[PDB]
Design a protein around this nucleic acid. Structure first.
Lengths: 42, 53, 116, 113
RNA sequence: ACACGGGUUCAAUAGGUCAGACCUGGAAGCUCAGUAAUGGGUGUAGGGAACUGGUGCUAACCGGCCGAAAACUU
RNA sequence: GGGUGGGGGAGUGAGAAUGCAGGCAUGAGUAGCGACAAGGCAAGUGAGAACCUUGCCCGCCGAAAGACCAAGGGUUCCUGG
RNA sequence: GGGAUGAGCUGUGGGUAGGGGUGAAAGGCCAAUCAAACUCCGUGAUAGCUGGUUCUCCCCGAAAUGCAUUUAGGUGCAGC
RNA sequence: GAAAAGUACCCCGGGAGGGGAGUGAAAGAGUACCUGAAACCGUGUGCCUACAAUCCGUCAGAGCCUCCUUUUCCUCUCCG
């Protein structure tokens, strides 16, 4: 019962991976914002 | 329970100053060679050579 | 020996017992133990009594001591050399000398050794 | 009148008030007896100070050409040194600050026949 | 804690030893009865904490520090 | 890098907004120092050791305080310093 | 202390996403917060209420009263 | 600091750090370094304080201590 977060990188990639960002029009606009700010992306 | 106010500089220094170490020593301490001084409590050990500086 | 007022050494009295037995073992096997002063004080009458039984010398004395010291080699030494050697003395077989303190706990250290 | 010699140590990893507690024992005392006191100080924090006083003896005797047997601690300082800080976690996410205080110790010795 | 009380080798305050008081209740070994479990003798035993009284056997250190040197009237 | 004087122009005068950033204080050398398994001794290393090392005792879990995989961590392993 | 072969517990991989989801329903749970989650944008939002507004000198010097108010803890005209 | 000229060497010290020499116009320019404020800690020192209650001051105000002019005077006086 007492937990908070149980990491799993495969799941993180399939859910938060930029590949999934590419899947949508909305996700692409997110990425392009990150490029201008100058950050390393997911 | 908390300090409602700062203790004045005077009283804080009085309490701080009531925090000291004791002074104990002995002279005339004869050991092999130089008469190194020790405390009375460890004098017997000094006579037996059970100290090191 | 006499009970001790206040806290027992280390943990409970069982631990105190084990401590006194092992220190006594070391003492008989070396002749000079450097430890804490309280433990040396507690250690005196215990070893003093054990030596008294060695001085007398007997089977039931061996049983009595073996109730306390599981190691036998020190008993051989005790009932072969030490006891008989201290036969010409009526009590007071140990000596305690004050030792310089330990940097880390300011322990009033002391060394306990046999008179000879 | 009193051609003193000076020795000091910087960036010592010892708390100021603890140093003060030690050095209050040696004001106006002779060098050899003061060092004996510090050797037998139960505070177990007099070491560095004794080292500093030793440096006073070395400078006073060799650089100045004075007799160690006559040296007296004219004055001693427990100056507040550069304090650093490191954070410590406590309950309920409280982020407290534990400090690492240092000091600078200055010793002045002089011949007082 | 500190303080207080007594003593500090012309000494018995502490520890030990020995002998007692007191508590426990009959040690091991040996021997005897019994196939055994166990019971008797050696033995009011053996062991032992404070208490009592002797015994200078070890430790109280062949030693340090602080502590008066006084203005006149009546 | 600034004074005297006539003029122009202001992010212009801090004593408080349970204000903000930095630094330093009182509380205070107080509390706390992290399971009710337990350490001890000798020798040695060392300027220095109750906490490291080597020996010997003691004590503790032992369907877990043992030994292996995944996930995860991503050099934390070893040697030397 | 209760259940502990059952409406069971658990890991792995997957889906449901905001005036919407889920719910053996309590209006709790949805990244420590839920009678409508989080970040950003419009945003320098708003507030008849609170709180703060930095140096000085010289002269002069109020009211807490009326009228009206989706108004009486505000504002407007008048009075000073 | 214009320049690294980065305190060789020697002495304490386990080292760090420091000192004496020395460079530099300067070390009051030592990597923790232009000027180095305040709060703050600390050493030394003149004065007050252990029979006394008041936002912790002001005004009266004794007697000590630092400094200083005139002056009897020290005439040692062409010195102070």
């Amino acid at each position: 019962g007492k937990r908070t977060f149980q990491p799993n990188n495969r799941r993180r990639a399939r859910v938060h991976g930029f590949r999934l960002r590419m899947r949508t029009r909305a996700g692409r606009s997110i990425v392009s914002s990150r490029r201008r700010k100058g950050r390393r992306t997911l | 329970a908390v300090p409602k106010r700062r203790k004045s500089r005077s009283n804080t220094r009085s309490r701080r100053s009531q925090w000291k170490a004791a002074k104990t020593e002995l002279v005339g301490v004869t050991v092999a060679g130089h008469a190194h001084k020790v405390p009375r409590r460890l004098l017997k050990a000094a006579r037996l050579g059970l100290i090191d500086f | 020996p006499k009970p001790t007022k206040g806290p027992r050494l280390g943990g409970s009295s069982s631990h105190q017992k084990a401590i006194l037995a092992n220190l006594a073992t070391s003492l008989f096997e070396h002749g000079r133990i450097t430890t804490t002063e309280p433990k040396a004080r507690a250690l005196r009458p215990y070893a003093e009594k054990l030596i008294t039984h060695a001085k007398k010398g007997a089977l039931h004395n061996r049983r009595e001591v073996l109730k306390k010291l599981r190691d036998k080699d020190v008993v051989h030494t005790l009932f072969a050399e030490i006891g008989p050697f201290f036969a010409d003395r009526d009590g007071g077989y140990t000596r305690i000398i004050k030792i310089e303190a330990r940097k880390g706990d300011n322990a009033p250290m002391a060394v306990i050794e046999l008179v000879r | 009148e009193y051609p003193s010699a000076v020795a000091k140590a910087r960036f010592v990893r010892v708390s100021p008030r603890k140093a003060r507690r030690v050095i209050d024992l040696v004001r106006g005392r002779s060098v050899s007896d003061a060092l004996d006191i510090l050797r037998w100080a139960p505070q177990a924090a007099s070491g560095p100070v004794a080292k500093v006083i030793a440096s006073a003896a070395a400078n006073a005797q060799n650089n100045g050409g004075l007799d160690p047997a006559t040296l007296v601690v004219a004055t001693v300082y427990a100056d507040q040194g550069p304090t650093a800080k490191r954070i410590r976690p406590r309950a309920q996410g409280r982020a407290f600050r534990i400090r690492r205080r240092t000091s600078h110790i200055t010793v002045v010795v002089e011949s007082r026949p």
